[PDB]
Each structure stands twice: as structure tokens, then as C-alpha cells.
Design a protein around this ligand. Structure first.
Ligand SMILES: c1ccc2[nH]ccc2c1
Ligand SMILES: c1ccc2[nH]ccc2c1
Ligand SMILES: c1ccc2[nH]ccc2c1
Ligand code: FES
Ligand code: FES
Ligand code: FES
Ligand SMILES: [Fe+3]
Ligand SMILES: [Fe+3]
Ligand SMILES: [Fe+3]
Lengths: 193, 447, 193, 193, 447, 447
């Protein structure tokens, strides 16, 4: 649908993701993806991190949040690493982060933190080659509050792949976020987007 | 406040007034006496290798453009147009032969020169003296094994002399390993802490590791673990602390080459570091080859810190007395297999980057200690740094600098704050030297 | 689904609410709950408070917003009142608040305020014992602007019970919000969440 | 449903818009409107402005965002222009704004900006007289980030008319926004709401 | 600004410069001369009844830990670690025998003592003098019938003497009723107003009630209603105003025991208060038993305010010249049935808490009056407090203090601002006493 | 900083210290020496035509109520109650005979008088001297062809004299066209720039148009287009620049009557302006009738700017050194068909309002130049304004003021900053006059 020679601001990656959703629209799949993401965001909001790992996250997951360096729109010569990885986790690494959240000596989790997540703009399309796999796109606003007057609000678009799994338990196999703010003003990015 | 006379740091660096982490007049005074006078980290050769490559960097609150010249040298200029003061470069890195201002179109070369002015003949005729309108240049730019530092003060000691006794400890990893590379882009996050809170923690604080990082060590699956929750005090002879005349210092934890990296990297790293140490024994001696594969927690005065072996590299960029912008890069040895470089870089960000689970343990400590420096009843209170005082030596036959032969102490805090005091109460480098002519004697009292 | 001995950060209350939604999923009920909440949020946004009371609020309503004191995660001895009530209103008390909003001498309502509400993450499940009653969970972002440059943004999760009523007019019988920010930085909480 | 003599804070315009949606509810239309708006917001977020114009915007469009002067709630004598137009664009004027975004010399678009849009509270109803026309109401949160540490967040309700067009390509023929903040604290309103 | 000489408050408290609600240098000077010198509300016995119970509280901008000791007394300490200054306690209330710092693990008892330091023998040996490292203690902590106040200045008059003539008016409800309890947790909200704006309103402003609260009175369904929109001026003899040497003062509205509570609580409250008044007539006399069930709007200098009978209890915690954090509790009589206590507590929050519809009526008044103190043309303007001037008496045979025998006036503003002036221009308590040796004569001029 | 002696602006306005756009002490000093001393735009007759009509406006950081009196005159008062200082009016425009305070109900007339106080007889008796309690009145309020300006300083020159030599250039469009109307409400947006950054740009910056606005000109479809990207320098004799004693100045681009309006309005506007110019040739002469339909980019000192013909009218309301609230109105000729008025008003907002695509091109230029004035190494740097210096004349036979007979230069910056210097270093109007007795000689050096 997009011609990126004409639509000069659009990246090749973004144009490919638009092509995936404007073709085969299955309303039932969209509703199913909406339920899945609302349940995942409820487990995270109540800080049921073990339940999230067990019910929502696949053993082959890649959970990745990048931060891209700011470069000129006309850049074409400088070709060094374009982005670092804020997260680039396999299942074991997510498990380490969950154990860190749950440890009694994680002093920053006392008083208990308060999370509220707002998931919108859900789109879903099956993968063309692997029918175990569903592409789901959604945007999240995440509010994390603590210690009386600390309030941090995170904003991001999520490009996910979820696989059927067994027993109706669809599980995340890839989450990719290109975080929109280069310099974070939320103290850290220590939240699961 | 009269900075010639006010005792902000007590004799021998034993204590500091808590107001130093909260007073905004002192922060403005540090812009002149700390940031415009001392050497500040800019970039690494690996991030601007080719002619025309540039990056932007902060030096205190100022922003500079750091550019690789055609002759192979590096020059750095204020990122401010010489006409009406607009910010010239709005990106973080690139490759260019010059920078054009978006306001009136003046074009500056990579060498800072004013090269072109739109319609110069019709408008200025021959009146514009472009030779006097180059970008404001950072007077001093020098390298320590590929790590590039800048200083606005032409009078500063050379960078190697400024590192003083700390240079000997950095050389095994920075020089004898074959060289390090800096992996970019950095993570960038704002914290509500004074710049000195993270600088003091990295220069000399091993005491907090077992308690502050109890959850990260226990969850983490790293080699310094058993310390989780202060369940064990490290072995006698497990490390040392050092400090130097111009303020840089570090802690040395013997043989902890895998550092904070979880168990997934432990074996491969312990295997790479021990193989290079065997080769280095013949070249630089057993003690120095052991230092290569020993974990150093260091601050290069004022605000650049690192964890060697773990590969964490930080810049604590000051914004105001309770705001700092934290830049986090990874450092890797150039001769490590590519795949191991990539994994180590992610591991650095996993543990100490924007979503670093170890770095998040320190947030409340750094922020609240800094913010309490503004509270009325705490401004004139004394922050203590006396652990180990009276057991430090100088001029040892094996380890140089003012050295505390114990893994946990506050030796390096005392050296950092002695240098800070001598800068804040001095008007120039000559006065700092006069205020520091008995620096090591002051730090070793009681010993 | 949750074991709160293992998922150490999860409260017993939150684990019960998750159990309610992951079992019997009725897609039709979710859509109906979404319409109901979007209509309620439109009436509130246009400040039709009498119409809200008449069309959306049951005579037996309890409308409650609490603020919980910050206590240690390991606390087990101190057992005094855990939270005050920012709101704990019956129908008559809501009516008093609506009359206060509509009074010509409410000077703070001149110039007219501007409200925008964003309702997401809707989940719905019928009560097991009372079939007149539907449990609806949803999250709200509320933006209240006034006086040129005052902007306040509120964030919260809502645990509601709605009853069938008559004529297709479903009406709120309970709204419970545990407000996530302990110290409010919005001047007041004088908005209907 | 609303009586604006009783519901003293409600404008005649707002009461008319509520009447449009509470009567004929077609669940299928609501889902279709949700898909349409999610696709439009994806094209805008990836800055595919030409694709947005070509796929989403009708040739007869009026794209209007007003800013209303703050006046007393009891005002009845002063009758000068009530609001200026932040936007009041036809198709050609939107095309000029898109060319401005795409021009290589738009210096403020280097480094590339990052947009994230959150569309909620979707309601849809067919026009009574023109069956080519669908009324769609939705609320948007728009996040625009750039230059390391500039973050601006816009909040608004959108009153749209979309027409069937041809080939299943529904296109916007009217967008009306009454922007809720009188004094903007986002540097400019240079975003497509 | 020279605070010895600048006339911020005119003679007899008749007017105040508008800059006092906006000037940040004056706010910093109030931290020393107002907040570090006077008695500030901390908590109530009912919120920390058992050994080990603690709460955190602000005193000016400082945060303190307030803890019930094993011997039954209460001690309060700065919430700041004696090592490197981290905030010790991050919760609002609890029960503990001590507090451990999350940075390096130092452990302080509930009595403030430094009780344990991790690895003290191996690290400090015998060098650490823990006896000199207890938490910084609030010098003075005293109770007024279960209400606990703190003062950092050892030289302050005892709390009962500091309440002066206001104590006589509070005693019927605070003492002779059988005692009050404070219902927690408080509501907590930030307002963009100076702390003095709400303090002056509660100390002496009955004039604003009919107009500011016209909608709350009319919608509300309370006993002071008929005043909505200034439709009626209260009866001759409907109340009085009073003020005292150290700044505390209040208004008295005879018999308004249901206060601001809507009609749903009116009957039960009018019935409870009148029954207790009948018993109290025999014990303390008819006038004092009437005061018990009369509505008092009071400020206990500087920043603690209350509405007795309505049961509203406030702390106006200063953050900067145009920022205040408002804490709202409910006060109930201990011998009221439990169910009535619960309903009264909700009613207090319904009307004056975070979503209080009466308190919301005051927001714009308090915020804009404070913010206009920063505006250039208003800084040197005069805020007026002359209503009732020249009709106030002192030493009356029935009502003590400087008293205005009228329900509506500005007597209490004049007493509050006379005391404020005398503190801001004084360096210590002795100078305040010298500046206040003719306090009541100054307030009663023209009478 | 000593403002009598500090050279913030160099001789002949050739350069300014960059700190003037960032220093907060200087901003506070400008509140006194710039904003409380000079004439500031308030409103237009067209926005308050009838008795009782009012608007609120800023004058510096102060807010005033501007009201049409029954006798047809306009008076303006601080928007601050004389009792306890609450903000009186919370709306932007309306029609009323008076303003009642929401705190205690005092009622002020449209003429500023204190007309009523609730229960005045019962409460104040005859004590309240209402005659001395009127709202604080703006001393001077004058009109320039329907455009209403205010000044707090009774000593200022009359507004017509203050406009000096700029008045001659404004008269063709403001007076001889038949009169202008101001179309409301304005757009209102905050920018993170100093007020002087947009003021200097509108007073004298034609140099930035081709480069800053390259995308708007190219996309735009306007008459000044061919300049996009500096692809063409305007014809010799395409315009001129002027400045005046009290700081106002402008650029003149001959015949550009359609201004920034896209191609959709070009033909109709070029046709309306040229028809009125033909009529005006007989009345005011060919040069002045040409000026009528020539684009003027003007700043009326300090902070009011406009683009005639384009019809943009701005107020740069100062908030702090790096914050300005931008108000944008449209100006139209009263005898233009209604439909053309409406389209021109939308066009003004389309190009220069809150979502103005031309105004958005300037954001980064104005914000970063202002914020760089706070950065340590830039504070004492020099912003240059020397283009055209030594070619400016004064007292020309055809064009009045200090004039640069070239379309692009910095003449008007030099005049603006000479006047700014003379105000910041002066304590009153007499001292400004003494500092300006050789104003045109200073600006024409080298010529
Ligand atoms: C290991 C040892 C000492 C340290 N100081 C700061 C981090 C860190 C890690
Ligand atoms: C009743 C009487 C006087 C008062 N002052 C502040 C609140 C209040 C209520
Ligand atoms: C045309 C000419 C000069 C100008 N200065 C600012 C805007 C503008 C437009
Ligand atoms: S400010 Fe850079 S060219 Fe003018
Ligand atoms: S700061 Fe508390 S133990 Fe070190
Ligand atoms: S502050 Fe205006 S009437 Fe009291
Ligand atoms: Fe640490
Ligand atoms: Fe009140
Ligand atoms: Fe411009």
C-alpha cells in the first residue's frame, strides 16, 4: 500500500508491517488478540510475574526493547551500531528479572508499587508460513507509581508474535519495542512493556 | 557562601557537608571550578574512526561536537552557532564534512572554521572576518588508549599525569590487553540525584554491594553472589582500594573477571581472562597480569566511572544539584570473538543500563541521599567517610597511590573529596597545586 | 490460576479478581460492557451529570475510591485502618455532588471545565450467585482541563458491579477504585472516575 | 435523553451528539469503525502522510480543530467570534501540510520524530439522511517525541464523518475537534489529531 | 531583604505585603524562623499506641520518624541515615524495633541509637563511636491530650504555654469530652498555594463561608446553610473570634455541633453533642460546656488547622512559596459509638478531603492569592486584615485572649500575622519575647 | 550583576552577550526596567466595542482587566482583589458592569471602583474607606488607530511619540487604508524561548526567511517562495530596514501584499491591495501608497510584533528567561469583504498560529538560541548583529529613522538592542533619554 520512495519519512520495516494488517482482516482474531493482551496486562498490573511467565510467555521467547541513536534523516555514511538493547531477553533472563522483583530484599519494592496499563490499537494477522504463529500489534500506556509522589508514564508500540501453544494457552514468542523517547525521564525503564 | 573559606570537606576527606549534594549555588560554582577545569570523557576512537565521523557529547552542562579530522586527530567545538547562538547539530552521531546552521545557513567545517555564509558577497561584502568566527574550540583533547577526554582549561596537566597513580591500575586492561573498544549507542536516562552520588559510589563503595544489591546478586547468578544480604564477608586479601592526587580512584576485587555477569557468561569469560593473563605474566609480571583480570570499580575524576571486566562505562552528566543524565556504554576487549562482544554488551545493559536490574537497586540510595542535602536540618550535617582511616599507606613497593590494603573501605572517597575541596576553594590550576602539595600526607594521617 | 504463596507480590483480593475473568469468557458480554462504559464516559465528559445519575447509576450504588497508606511489604503487626475513603458514596451523596457541580454559584466551574476520558482494558463476567449482576473491570485515563493552563490527568483501574435494571438500562451498583497515587498532584480528586 | 434545561452544564451541540449514538446501536458498525481508526492511526504513527491522504482522506474533507475563548458560564451579551481555527483545512491545504512534512529541508524533522497514538471510546452511527455517511466519535491520546528529551502529549475527542467511497475504502469527509486546553503547553499543535 | 527592618506586616497586623505568599527567599527564611523554631503537629496517640509503632511526618520540609518507645514515651528523629544520608524509612506507618538502611545496612533502634553496623569488627574494629552516631533527634516532643507536637528548638515555651489563650477554648472538646481520637490514614494532596493561605483561612475567616461555599452549603444539607450566597447574616451574638500571643487563634460559632456535615448526620450529632453538654454543665460550667459543642475554626500556629465538631484536622506542609502538601485527618470523640465514628470520618473526607466538595471551593482562592504574590505589580501591595479593628478586647471576664465579640471579623488574622512578624524579624525565642512584650496592646488599639 | 555598568549590548548594538536570553536575574530586572516602563499591547477597539465589554491581557507577568467605560474610553486595572489578593476575573473576555470576587464577595465596577462589600454596614460600619480601595489602575492607556496599549509608568512619552520614526511606516496600513480590525480570539501557545528571540526575529530578520522557512515557502505556494533554500537573493532595491529611538523597527519588502498566504489567496489579495493603492496615490503620495501594500515585519518595542499584509499580529508574553506565552491574532482591513476577512484570518492561523507550519519552522531556532544562553561556556559569548553596519543613514529625504537601504540586514536588531541597553542601565525615563541623546549617531557609525 505504501511506496517508500514517495512516502519519504516511512521506513522499510514499518511499510512491511502495514502490509501485514491491511490485507486479510479476521474480526474474530482481532477480538481474541484483544482478550489475550487484556489478560496479560491484568497479570502484570497485579504483579503476578510468575503467573505471567507461566501463562503468557513461551520458552522460545525473545523479549526486546531497543533504544535507537538519533541520526540525521539524510545519513548514509555512518554505519555503526544503530541501537542499544534496553531489554533483549530469553526465557531464563526473564526468569532472573522476575526472581529479582519477588525477592524479599528488593528494597525498592517496599512500599508495594502500583501499576496501571492501558492497551489500545490492537491489530492481529496470522503468519503466512507458520500457522502456529499470530502477529499482534498494540500500543501501551503504562503508569508506575510509588513512594507517595513518584509517577512515571511510559508510551510504546509493541510488535508481537504469539504462538498457539497447547490447551488454548497462547504464548508470547517475540515482543519487539523501539522505545520512542531517546533519553528516559522516568528514572529507569524497569517495567515490562 | 565563601568557597575560599567554607569547610565543605573536613581534613583528610573524613566527612563532607550534606549540602554539597543539594545546594544550587554550589552546583553553579562547580560548573566553573570542577567542570570547566578538569578532564571530561567525550568518546572513543571506535565510535568516530573515520574522517568526518562525529558525535555530540556533554562537558558539564555544555554540549560539544567531537569530530575526526582529515589528518587523523580529533577536535571538539561548542555546539553553538557563532552568529545568533542556535544549536548547530541536533543528532547524536554521524559523518559529515561540515555543519550548517538551520537559522541563517552559516556553514562550519568539521575543523570548526566558518567556511560559508549565504550571500556573503552581496550582504557582508568583505566586512565579515570569518577567520575570527570559527566555533568555540575545546582547548585540550587527549587520548588514553582510545578513550578521548576534553578539558576547557589550557592550564590542566596532561591527561596521563592527571590520572596519576590510577593509570598504573588501568593499564593492564586498557593497554596490555591489546586494547578496548567502546560499544555504542549508550543508554541515556535521567535520575534525580546529584552527579557526586553515583561518582562516589563507583569510586570507592564496595561496602554497599552485599546489601544494596542483595536481590540482584541472589537472582543474578554472578560470581560476587555469596555476598547477597551480607551473608558473607569476602576473604582476607580479596582486594584493595586506591586514590590519587587529582581525585581519581578505584577498588580492586582480585580475579573477578566475570564481574556482575550472570552465570550464562561466567565460564566463557573466566576462560578468556585467565588465558590472556597467562600470556601477560611474561610481559608485565604476575601482579599486573592479575590486575588485568581483576574487577576495578573506578571513577576518573570528576564524573566518568567504570567497572572493568563487567565492562560498564558511565558518564554522570550534571543537569542541576538534584538532576543527572546517566550515559551507559559497554567496554569490550578488541580481540574477543564478535559473538562474545555482542553478548557482553547486552549483559552490560541488562545489569547496569536503562533497565539494568543492578543499577535500579541504587536509584533510591542515590536520589534520596542527594535530595536530603536540600532539607533544612540536614544541610549542615556531616556525611561520613572514615572507614579505614589511619590504615592507608602511600608509596608502597608493589601498589602505587594512597592505598588501603583491604577490599572494603572508604579510602577512595577520601581522595575524591580531598581533590574536590581543593578545586572548589581554588581559582585556577596553580592554586589547586598549592592546595595539594601535601595531598598524600593528609590522606594517610593516623597510619 | 495464581498461587499467592509463590507469586509473592500478589494480594488475595487481586488473585480472586483474576480467577473471575479467565474462566467463562463470553465475547458478547465483553462488547456489551464496552458499549455501556463508553456511553457512561460520554455522558460524564459532556458534564451531563443528571443524565448520568438517571441512566447509569442504580439506587443501591456504593461509589468508592480509596487511598491506601504506604506500609512495609513485610508488615504484619500494625493493624490500624489501612485506607481512607476519598469517595464512599450512596445515591443521595452522589446527588449532592451533582447538585454542587450544577449550582450557578459554583465559581470554579466558570469558565466551563473540559473533560476527556479514555476507557480501556474492558473485561466482563457474570456473578455466580446473582444473575442480575455483571462484574465489569476497566481502566480509565481522565483528563481535566481548565483556566487556560491547568491540566490534570488521573489514572485508575475500576472494579464495577452493574445490574440489569429494566428496559435494557444497565445501572452501576458498585464502583471500587484503589487510587494508585498516594499523594495527589492534581490539586484535588474532584472528578468522577 | 438529555434535557439541557435541567442538565445545566450541557451544550445543545453535545446533547445532539449523545442522541445520535444511544438509539440505533449496530455492533458490526462499531467494530468496522474501530478497524478504520486503528489503521488510520497506524499510517499516521509511521509518518506515511501520503498514504494517509490517499487511503483515508476524502476529496471533500473539512479537517477542523478549534480553540474556544474562555467565557463566563453566565455570559449572554458578548457575541464576538467564540473560537479561532487551529486547523480548518480542505484537501489541498492538507496536501500542503503533508508536502511540508516530507520536504528534505524541513530541518525540524531531523532526527526523525516518533509518534504513538492511542484511540479509544469508539462509537459509530449512520447518518439519517445520507446513507453514504457514517458518524464516528473517538478519543485520542497522541505522544510526539523528539530531540532526546522533548515529549508532548495531546488529548482530544474527535467528531468525524466518513463516507463509503469505493472499493471498501472509507474516507474521512469531516473531522471536528474542540481542543480542550486553551493555552497549549506542547510547543505547537503541529500534529494530525 | 533585611528581615530585621522590612515591614512585612504593618502595626497591629492590619495589613501584610502580598509578597509574603510568593517570595522564595522569604520561604527559605521561614524554614529557619518559623518551622525550625515553633511547635509542629506530628501524630496522635491513637495512631501509634503500642511500643514499636511509628509514623513518618513532615516538620517544615524535613521528614521525621515518630516512634512509641518501650517506656511509653514518644521520640522523633530525622529520617536520614547518619552514614551517607539516605532516607531511612520509606513507608508512612508500621511497627518495628528498629530501622535498617538499604544502602549499607546500618541498623538504628526505635530509640534512634546506632545499634548495628554490618561487619563492624572486621571493618571499623573499635574505631566507630556508635554512641555519637544516633539519629538526629527532635529536641522537644510534647502532648496536648493525645495530640503530639514536635519542635526542633530546645528554647521554645512548653506546648501548653505556647497555645496561650487558645488552650482554654480547645479544652472542652480536647479534654472534658473524654478525649478525641485521630482517624487515619490522612488524605494527601498538593495545592499550588503558600502554606499561609489555608492557615489564615482556618484561623479567622468566617467572612468567606457564605460566598466561597455558596454551592456546598446549598447542595450540602448542613446546619450553616442559610448563609449560602450571603442570603443571610448570622444572628447578633452568633459567635466570637480570638487570638493569642504565640499566634494561635480561632473563630467560635455557637452551638454548631453538626458543622459542615450534611443533613444525614445532623440529627444524630445534635443529639450526641447536646447530651454531653448537659453532663458537662455540672463539671465545667455552662459557658465552657457550650463551647464544647460549638464549632471552632482554629489554627495552631504555624500550620496545623482544625474545625472542631465538623471533625476536620489539617496539616499545611510547606514545599515552596507556591506549593503546599495538604494532610487531612478526621477527629472523633472516643466515646461515640463506632458506627457514628466511621460515618463521621467519611463525612470529613467527603467535605474536606482529597475529593472534598467544600475544600474544592477554596482551591482557586488559595492558589491565585498565593501566585499573585509573585507578580511584579502586586509584590509590594497590601493585603488587608482590618475588619473589626478597634473593637477587640483583652482580659475579658468570660472569654480569654484578644477577643472580637462578633462572629465575622479579622481579629485572628491580626494575631497570627503579629506573631509571624515577630518571628521573621527575630533570631531566637528571646528576641521574639522582647518583640511581643506588648502583644495585646498592639492588637487592641482603637478599642 | 551591576546593570549600570555591565556591557550587555556593545556600542552601536553590534553584539549582545548570549546570557541576555537565559539569565533569570536579568529577567527579573527586565520586569522593572522593560515591562513596567514601556508601552505594551492590550487589545483592539474591535474586541471591546461596547460599554461593559472587557478582556484580560498580560502586561509583562502581571494580568490586567481592560474595560470599555460608559463614556467610550478604555481603562485597565490589575486583575487582583484589593482585599486578600485573589484573581478577580477568570475568563478571557465578556460583558459586565462589574466584577465580583469569589472569595469574600467584594464587588468592583467596570471603572475599578470598590462599589459593594457584603454586609458592609453590619461588619465595617463606616470604617471602610472604599474610595481608597479601587483596583490598581494602569496609569497610561492610549490608542494607535484602534490598537490599545498600556504603560504602568506615568512618565512615558505619549504612544505616538514612542513609536517614533516607525509610525510613518505603519500609517498607510493602520490609518490610510480606512482602518484595521483585530480578529479574535487569539491562538495561545507556550514556547521554551526568551521573549527577545521572537521579538528580534520579527523586528529585523529577513536573512533567515529563505533558509529557516525553505520547506514552508516551497510547500507553501506564496509570493516570497523563490527564496526557498536560498535559491535566489531578492532583487536589488527589494526593500529596506528601519529602526527608531525607542526601539521599534521593521523591515519593508516592497509590494508583497499577499505575504505568506498560499496561492489560494494570492490573486484576490494582489487585486485588493493594488486597487486601494491606486486610490491612495492621490491622498498620501506614491511612496506612502506603495508602503501600504508592502510587507512590513515589525516589532513595536518591547514584545509586540506583526507582519502587515500577511496580517499576523503577535504578543510575546514573558513568563521566565526561557519561557514565553505566544498570542497570535489576525489583522484585517475593515473594508475587505467579509468572506475574504474570514479566509485571511484562517490563513494567518494556518501559517503562524498554534499549528502554523511557518511558525513551527522557527521553534528550534528560538528555543535553542535562548536555552544556550544558560550554558556555562556561552553566557559570556557574543551574539552578532553587524550585517549592514556602516551603511545605515539617518534623516533621509524620503524614508525616516535610522534606515538601511537594503532588504536584508541587521539594522533593526541594532536599534532594538541599543534601546534595550539604555533601558536596562537606566532607573527611569529621564535617564533613558539622557542615555539616548545621541541614539542615531551611535547607530550610523562607519557610514
Ligand atoms: C562492584 C564493586 C564495587 C562497586 N561499586 C559500584 C558498583 C560496584 C560493583
Ligand atoms: C466554618 C467557619 C469558618 C471556617 N474557616 C474555614 C473553614 C470554615 C468553616
Ligand atoms: C517575512 C519577512 C521577514 C520576517 N521576519 C519574521 C517573519 C518574517 C516574514
Ligand atoms: S544563528 Fe546560526 S546562521 Fe544565524
Ligand atoms: S547511607 Fe545508610 S548505611 Fe550508608
Ligand atoms: S480576596 Fe476578594 S473579597 Fe476577599
Ligand atoms: Fe550499586
Ligand atoms: Fe473555605
Ligand atoms: Fe521565521
Amino acid at each position: 500500500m505504501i511506496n517508500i520512495q514517495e512516502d519519504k519519512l516511512v521506513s522499510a520495516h514499518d511499510a512491511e508491517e502495514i502490509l501485514r494488517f491491511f490485507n486479510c482482516h479476521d474480526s474474530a482474531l482481532q477480538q481474541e488478540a484483544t482478550t489475550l493482551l487484556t489478560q496479560e496486562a491484568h497479570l502484570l498490573d497485579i504483579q503476578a510475574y510468575r503467573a505471567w511467565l507461566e501463562h503468557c510467555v513461551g520458552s522460545e521467547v525473545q523479549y526486546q526493547v531497543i533504544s535507537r541513536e538519533l541520526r540525521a534523516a539524510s545519513e548514509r555514511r555512518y554505519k555503526l551500531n544503530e541501537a542499544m538493547n534496553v531489554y533483549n531477553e530469553n526465557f531464563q533472563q526473564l526468569k532472573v528479572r522476575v526472581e529479582h522483583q519477588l525477592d524479599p530484599q528488593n528494597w525498592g519494592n517496599s512500599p508495594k508499587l502500583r501499576f496501571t496499563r492501558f492497551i489500545t490499537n490492537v491489530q492481529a494477522a496470522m503468519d503466512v508460513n507458520d500457522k502456529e504463529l499470530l502477529h499482534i500489534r498494540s500500543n501501551v500506556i503504562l503508569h508506575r507509581a510509588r513512594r507517595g509522589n513518584q509517577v512515571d508514564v511510559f508510551y510504546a508500540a509493541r510488535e508481537d508474535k504469539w504462538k498457539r501453544g497447547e490447551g488454548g494457552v497462547r504464548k508470547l514468542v517475540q515482543r519487539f519495542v523501539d522505545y520512542p523517547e531517546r533519553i528516559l525521564q522516568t528514572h529507569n525503564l524497569m517495567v515490562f512493556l | 557562601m565563601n568557597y575560599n573559606n567554607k569547610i565543605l570537606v573536613s581534613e583528610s576527606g573524613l566527612s563532607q557537608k550534606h549540602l554539597i549534594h543539594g545546594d544550587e549555588e554550589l552546583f553553579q560554582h562547580e560548573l566553573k571550578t570542577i567542570f570547566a577545569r578538569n578532564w571530561l570523557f567525550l568518546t572513543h576512537d571506535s565510535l568516530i574512526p573515520a574522517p568526518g565521523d562525529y558525535v555530540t557529547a556533554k562537558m558539564g552542562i555544555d554540549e560539544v561536537i567531537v569530530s575526526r579530522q582529515n589528518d587523523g586527530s580529533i577536535r571538539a567545538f561548542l555546539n553553538v552557532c557563532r552568529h545568533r547562538g542556535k544549536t548547530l547539530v541536533s543528532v547524536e552521531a554521524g559523518n559529515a564534512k561540515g555543519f550548517v546552521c538551520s537559522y541563517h545557513g552559516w556553514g562550519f567545517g568539521s575543523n570548526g572554521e566558518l567556511q560559508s555564509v549565504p550571500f556573503e558577497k552581496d550582504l557582508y561584502g568583505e566586512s565579515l572576518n570569518k577567520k575570527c568566527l570559527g566555533l568555540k574550540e575545546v582547548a585540550r583533547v587527549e587520548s588514553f588508549h582510545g578513550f578521548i577526554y576534553g578539558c576547557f582549561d589550557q592550564e590542566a596537566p596532561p591527561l596521563m599525569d592527571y590520572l596519576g597513580d590510577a593509570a598504573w591500575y588501568l593499564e593492564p586492561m586498557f593497554k596490555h590487553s591489546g586494547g578496548l573498544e567502546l560499544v555504542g549507542p549508550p543508554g541515556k536516562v535521567v535520575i534525580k540525584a546529584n552527579w557526586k552520588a553515583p561518582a562516589e559510589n563507583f569510586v570507592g563503595d564496595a561496602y554497599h554491594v552485599g546489601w544494596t544489591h542483595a536481590s540482584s546478586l541472589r537472582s543474578g547468578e554472578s560470581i560476587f553472589s555469596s555476598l547477597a544480604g551480607n551473608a558473607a564477608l569476602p576473604p582476607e586479601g580479596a582486594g584493595l582500594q586506591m586514590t590519587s592526587k587529582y581525585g581519581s580512584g578505584m577498588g580492586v576485587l582480585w580475579d573477578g573477571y566475570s564481574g556482575v555477569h550472570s552465570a550464562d557468561l561466567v565460564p566463557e569469560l573466566m576462560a578468556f581472562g585467565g588465558a590472556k593473563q597467562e600470556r601477560l605474566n611474561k610481559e608485565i609480571g604476575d601482579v599486573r597480569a592479575r590486575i588485568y583480570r581483576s574487577h576495578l570499580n573506578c571513577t576518573v575524576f570528576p564524573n566518568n566511572s567504570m567497572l572493568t571486566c563487567s565492562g560498564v562505562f558511565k558518564v554522570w552528566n550534571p543537569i542541576d544539584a538534584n538532576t543527572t543524565e546517566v550515559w551507559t556504554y559497554a567496554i569490550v576487549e578488541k580481540d574477543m570473538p564478535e559473538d562474545l562482544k555482542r553478548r557482553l554488551a547486552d549483559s552490560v545493559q541488562r545489569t547496569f543500563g536503562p533497565a539494568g536490574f543492578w543499577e535500579s537497586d541504587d536509584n533510591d540510595n542515590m536520589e534520596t541521599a542527594s535530595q536530603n542535602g536540600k532539607k533544612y536540618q540536614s544541610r549542615d550535617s556531616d556525611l561520613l567517610s572514615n572507614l579505614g582511616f589511619g590504615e592507608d599507606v602511600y608509596g608502597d613497593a608493589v601498589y602505587p597511590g594512597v592505598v588501603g590494603k583491604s577490599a572494603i573501605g572508604e579510602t577512595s572517597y577520601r581522595g575524591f573529596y580531598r581533590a574536590y575541596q581543593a578545586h572548589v576553594s581554588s581559582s585556577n590550576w596553580a592554586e589547586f597545586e598549592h592546595a595539594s602539595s601535601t595531598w598524600h600526607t593528609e590522606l594517610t594521617k593516623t597510619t
